Design a protein. Structure first.
Ligand code: NI
Ligand code: NI
Ligand code: NI
Ligand code: NI
Ligand code: NI
Ligand code: NI
Lengths: 100, 553, 101, 553, 553, 100
């Protein structure tokens, strides 16, 4: 595979998101790290699919709602940022106020 | 020109009269003072203040600080004030108003071409923590503690060996030497404790001469009156501190016999409540004496629903004599009253190395909730309680071990070990950890990203933790004897060396905001703790702040 | 489209051009297989190989560099040799030359 | 004896006339020359050529190379040739024909008992990359860049501090010293830039005397005419380079005023296109001047569908004055024409540290696709375009910063910093990265496996990145002044030291294959770029090579 | 007072007459002797024996050990006995009865204030393993091997280069020097092998003078009679060892010609069975000669169902001449008989670096199962077979390479390289690995936990593997010539230096419990191995112990 | 668990394969690293099941077809190799031209 440090680093984010994903499935209100991980992983997969940065900037705001996370969590996350390999190379996706 | 206080707070952080909530607790701090000149605040950025001829002067390196933390909200034992912090030569240069004297008024911290900038507006800055109950079971503990905001670690050990698992002792010259050498590799300041259990003073003097800054008396090695006396005699001679874990079995005598053996001499009692070790069931009565500097280990802080249940197995007839709901509940209140002066971990030996700071604030939260405001509190804020508690893991531990001349607080002349916190994560996950003027660790995003913020963001070591830079930014504490015998040169230690002093003259009255000597008693049968006849107790928490909202596991 | 693919131009390459060559019939008289490399001094190969050693002096196998010829027990075959170049000094092998020639 | 060209290519790699596709791009290179003697190629293995008396001679260590890269396909600014590479004493000894003179003809690189072998048949070998726009925000950037094929990093910073996040400046003697010491721990060659924004020349001389090889003028510290002039005056004196990030706000003047302040003196303009900083909206016109060495940062290379969208937030009224589709589209073409001479990253400050090489080839691919063959191209291959682009991150950056006497290309006498690539992964994931004659990092399979190839295969540091071996295989560049004042001995630097020179005499005409000085203009209202009245533009890519086919994320 | 033998075994570990199963194998060991005085055993803990005035004396550091391993069950070539182990100054001080002479009888290992304690009751303690066939392909191999219980690694290489992938050679002075410097960073003792394939003795003397402790003759570099002779001549001169990988192709001669060239001189034959290299198909006949020290690499140990299938590709006409079921099956039996004296890995070049110990015990298990008890066995236990096999990776490798005066066994005066094992995980996953008196690596649980045992538990480096502590606890072996020429001072090596000696005088008769010289033959057509006309063979295992019950993957 | 470095290293491969597995499920054509990871993980599980080296050398060639991966990918993977603990110890499994 010849994994570079960055590819290995992203595997950490993916795994963190697996934890959050299973807890959300149980019906738990997600905490700070779980929320960031879940939304971030979503975006990376969107990039793998070939979606545009513009589309993901919007879609990322509809992954989790205020009723699916602990109190104060939405305020602790003014935005989420993550980079992934789009068909046209690495791009930064910034999602402002992802949880409403 | 005018600006609303809200827009101001968003731009330069809070000012006088503004309150800030500490993380998700019920503790609120109010800015007591602001050392700026409204309109002359320094801000870094495109088109901002810190630029040539403007907020940045023409002075040479010798005439300006190497680092300035702009618009910091300082929280220390002496106050909660807004100001700029200047760091020069790895030490705290001044707390005041930074800028360029050529065009700005009241500049006390000159910024020049040689000045680096750390934007602290909207952030809380504190002194690095000091943990004095470290079991050197593994080197990984250093990074864990550093990440939590602890910059100095005092303790003993040689690795995952039976002796170290149980006691904070680095036995003898050979191991002491080896550990002093290994210390150069760790990103925190370090001081070692030797084995103080022996009735031959020369066996102790050797260890001090080898490098230890203290001696640990532990019951596993025999905390007998003869051993205790011998260790204190050598301590008084060599100006080093003694840490005690008394005779839980009451084999050689009761608590009063141990106190008698100590004979009014200065001593640091570890986990004074008893769960972590000590005369059953009244070692807690030690906090009434003037020569005792009492500390708590962290598993019992604060009293919660699961506390008792987990403790039996972490310990596993004298189990139920050691684990007592009565003394565990009282301990929290004694901290709130200032009867207990320090907090520590007891790393991997009935203690959590990365939870010293976090647990200290949870106790403060639970005490405010249960007991209301302190009698010393002024105004509608928890400023005094905050000062009382922060002192427990910063200045007090430093005073107890004779290193307050180097670290322990944000004061001029002291080593620049600082922790920057976002108010929402205060005491839980720091934004930046500075060791000797250099950032040693901080949360860092994707290395290949266009900016440092994209996920995944996790703590990664910075330049202050690398090779020679690290050696220059950390201190290895030695006993006056070791320093004199030239141990640093002999072992070829590469880090900065600091010497301990003032260990024998410190007393309970010297503990900042925590000098209470209560008329405390413990019922031999029921284990109830009473101060002046009044029952001291508290209720166990079902939920705590600084917990499930921040951690992934 | 194949990542990093080659576009080798058709044709052939002539190896060891302008060097003296000679052919010799070799027969493996041993009971175990023997394999010889392209640059080994042929006159100093395994003693079980029977051939005119005098003619093979200063010669090696005229085959692509790095390849080898295999001789199974009892195998007889004709190989083409090419003369060494450079200083034409032979050192090593079975230690029969250890000097120029 | 005869052998078909296909079987030959499979055995020794391609030869004269053969073409190879670079990764999954449309760029094809044709072997221009082959320095071997057909039939005398050296190959390592059981029964192969490199053996005692055969391809390996009887010479002593002094009379043979330490390392030989067999049958390498070299791709450098001077040519695309097939040959053996000899390395001796950590430096490039010769490019020619390896072997044993005792039995082989035309041997120029003697192989003996002291020679190690690296099989390069079927592989492409290039010089290590050189990134001159590094923000030392975190030490992890070094490994990321090394893995991508970059072996030299020039920049400034002190860690994740506000000043460093924004500028490539290591402020003052203390930080410069600390960072020089930290540099010994990193597996790449390093040179530091100080803060050049000051109107007092002595404040700059101090930094140069401390160790920096250049000074960065950044608008955040005030890129005023007075500061620029002061920095260039000290540069001319001390033979160090100046890097510029101009006044985007046009606060002190327009682009012409800055150019006037520079006064024809040598200077390296960072991110000349403007998105990363500079006079809005015409800083790009700088590439027309003979004294300007222009470089691009990598987020804008090449122009794609998502470029504009992502850029607004990586930046977040002057946003839309800085982010311009017109100048972004033109930049690619200017690189193809040779008007822009270098490529860099701008690590974690609007740039991707591990994507300098990768993006340079994507621009070349997109330009071939859109513009066809270059006027200098001969034959049905992209050999000239390849030489023009590889020069942008190897020799040109080295010439611009006065270190071309040590690194920058595969030439005799230079440090042996080489990168081995499989054609299918060229510019994306290297097979081997050699630092000073020792492999420093490479993809490595299961450590416990029977062979080094079983999964998982990922980049892991090798012996060339370990302690003292590392110090011997890396260089820390110093200014002539610092070297003279004995800074290396004072700070006790353990790595090899190299001095910079020739920074003030280099000009646009000296940039290899990239010396174009176009009559370029920018429309103040529309932002359209025109060279000789012709509109310079290009189309954004929807898909790019060296992307989704290689990365897991 | 009395105590049942079961309660005793639970409290102090097994005693005389008790048997213990080795992991999940069918091998059982019986305690042959116990050096304690029943009732006077030392135990550490609250209220236990090792306390001031009790089990701990009043002696000064010079008069007591630095470390004591209490109630250890020693398994070494000389015996399987229960005793306390004393370590002083990084070396084995004594094996006997620890305690305080003031109140206890028969104390041979004094415990004082300077003594650290490691509780070994219920544990098996062995000498660290020694692997003499290491390909330095990557530095990660050191940690993998250390974790398995191997503390000394001898081999050659420069990293993932073609030459190293195939041979254990560190070519020439430059690479030898660089690797000696890199060695200071690794937590194991290291000795290097140079390239022995050359017919000019001076080219070899240079390498020995540079630092190598041996020379590897490999067929890939030309294992011709002339090269072999030259290497042995220099070896006899400089007292260094020669390792051989013969001419598989039979190009220069057959096995008898190679043996003739060796001329009765001492030599270590690598992978003597042949699969890993050597005259096809009879290199195995080498074990019949007195001057040959034969070892096996580990992929062929033991013979199993999948062995042949996997081997073809790990190798990929001479494949089927090299991979032979006949010689592979015989090899196991030859180990059981003592005809083969050592086991090694052949790390990442047809060998598994972390499976030397594990595979040696699997062979012993399979041989007991197939052949029953050995003729030398006494009692109903496998004590002799155990001693015979443990010698293969401890003392024998040390004797073969002239380092038995420093390591190789648990004997007084030798470096304290010890491995502590829980019987259930013996030979698979150790509890503690001690390097030179300091724990270098061990399984460690959650760093932030209240105790060191909570999950996840995985191997993490300890203090013995950190910087200067590491240098003090490891040895770099040099040739007598290198030591004399002052190589350590020149390269500025920081670790402890040890010199090799006695390499030319060791013979087959000297191999502990493995000195058999069988009248062995191999059928040229069928490949059948026969000793005294008897066919030597064995059956392939379908399932093996020390496998799927312990590993996650 | 007492995980050795190699056991921890394999956890990296397993996790990489989880990424590939989910993308294949979405109907995406796998890239170079995803393909190597997916096939490798398959083999490790086969070894855990107790299948022989010979059986896996063949089975591994039927995990992914040329139509389930991006163009050029099959050519970038001439073979795949991975080791795992079989009932009879660690063995190397080499799958030649796994994608056809
Ligand atoms: Ni205790
Ligand atoms: Ni403790
Ligand atoms: Ni810039
Ligand atoms: Ni920049
Ligand atoms: Ni071999
Ligand atoms: Ni080998």
């Amino acid at each position: 595979m010849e994994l570079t440090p960055r590819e290995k680093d992203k595997l950490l984010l993916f795994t963190a998101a697996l934890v959050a994903e299973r807890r959300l499935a149980r019906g738990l209100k997600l905490n700070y790290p779980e929320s960031v991980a879940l939304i971030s992983a979503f975006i990376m997969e969107g990039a793998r699919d070939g979606k545009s940065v513009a589309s993901l900037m919007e879609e990322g705001r509809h992954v989790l709602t205020r009723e699916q996370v602990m109190e104060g969590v939405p305020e602790m996350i003014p935005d989420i940022q993550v980079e992934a390999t789009f068909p046209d190379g690495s791009k930064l996706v910034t999602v402002h106020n992802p949880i409403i | 020109s005018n600006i609303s206080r809200q827009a101001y707070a968003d731009m330069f952080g809070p000012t006088v009269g503004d309150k800030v909530r500490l993380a998700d607790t019920e503790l609120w701090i109010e800015v007591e003072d602001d050392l700026t000149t409204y309109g002359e605040e320094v801000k870094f950025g495109g088109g901002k203040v810190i630029r040539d001829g403007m907020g940045q002067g023409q002075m040479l390196a010798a005439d300006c600080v190497d680092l300035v933390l702009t618009n910091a909200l300082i929280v220390d034992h002496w106050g909660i004030v807004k100001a700029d912090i200047g760091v020069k030569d790895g030490r705290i240069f001044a707390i005041g108003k930074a800028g360029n004297p050529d065009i700005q008024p009241n500049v006390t911290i000159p910024i020049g071409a040689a000045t680096e900038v750390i934007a602290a507006e909207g952030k809380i800055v504190t002194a690095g923590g000091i943990d004095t109950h470290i079991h050197w079971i593994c080197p990984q503990q250093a990074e864990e503690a550093l990440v939590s905001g602890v910059t100095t670690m005092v303790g003993g050990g040689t690795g995952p060996a039976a002796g170290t698992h149980a006691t904070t002792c680095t036995p003898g010259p050979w191991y002491i030497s080896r550990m002093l050498q290994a210390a150069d590799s760790l990103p925190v300041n370090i001081g070692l404790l030797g084995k103080g259990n022996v009735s031959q003073p020369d066996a102790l003097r050797e260890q001090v001469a080898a490098g230890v800054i203290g001696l640990k008396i532990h019951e596993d090695w025999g905390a007998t009156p003869a051993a205790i006396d011998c260790a204190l005699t050598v301590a008084d001679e060599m100006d080093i501190q003694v840490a005690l874990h008394s005779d839980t079995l009451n084999e050689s005598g009761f608590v009063e016999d141990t106190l008698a053996a100590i004979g009014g001499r200065t001593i640091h009692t570890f986990h004074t409540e008893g769960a972590g070790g000590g005369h059953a069931p009244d070692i807690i009565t030690a906090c009434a004496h003037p020569n005792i500097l009492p500390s708590s280990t962290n598993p019992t802080l604060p009293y919660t629903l699961n506390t008792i249940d987990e403790h039996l197995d972490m310990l596993m007839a004298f189990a139920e004599s050691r684990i007592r709901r009565e003394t565990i509940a009282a301990e929290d209140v004694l901290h709130d009253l200032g009867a207990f002066s320090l907090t520590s971990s007891d790393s991997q030996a009935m203690g959590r190395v990365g939870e010293v700071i976090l647990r200290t604030w949870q106790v403060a939260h639970r005490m405010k909730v249960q007991r209301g405001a302190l009698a010393e509190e002024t105004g509608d804020n928890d400023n005094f309680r905050v000062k009382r508690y922060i002192a427990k893991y910063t200045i007090n531990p430093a005073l107890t071990h004779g290193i307050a001349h180097e670290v322990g607080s944000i004061e001029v002349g002291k080593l620049a070990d600082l922790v920057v916190w976002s108010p929402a994560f205060f005491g839980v996950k720091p934004a930046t950890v500075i060791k000797g003027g250099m950032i040693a660790i901080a949360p860092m995003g994707d290395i290949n990203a266009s900016i440092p913020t994209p996920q995944p963001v996790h703590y990664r070591p910075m330049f202050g933790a690398l090779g020679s830079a690290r050696h220059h930014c950390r201190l290895t504490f030695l006993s006056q004897a070791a320093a004199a015998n030239g141990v640093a040169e002999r072992l070829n230690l590469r880090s900065a060396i600091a010497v301990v002093k003032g260990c024998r003259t410190v007393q309970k009255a010297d503990m900042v905001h925590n000098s209470l000597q209560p008329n405390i008693t413990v019922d031999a049968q029921t284990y109830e703790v009473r101060v002046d006849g009044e029952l001291i107790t508290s209720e166990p928490a079902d939920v705590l702040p600084m917990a499930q909202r921040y951690f992934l596991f | 489209m194949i990542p990093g693919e080659y576009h080798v131009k058709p044709g052939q390459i002539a190896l060891n051009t302008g060097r003296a060559t000679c052919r010799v019939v070799v027969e493996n008289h041993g009971d175990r297989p023997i394999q010889v490399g392209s640059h080994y001094h042929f006159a100093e190969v395994n003693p079980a190989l029977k051939f005119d050693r005098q003619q093979a002096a200063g010669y090696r196998l005229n085959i692509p560099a790095g390849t080898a010829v295999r001789f199974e027990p009892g195998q007889k075959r004709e190989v083409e040799l090419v003369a060494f170049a450079g200083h034409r000094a032979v050192f090593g092998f079975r230690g029969e030359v250890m000097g120029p020639l």
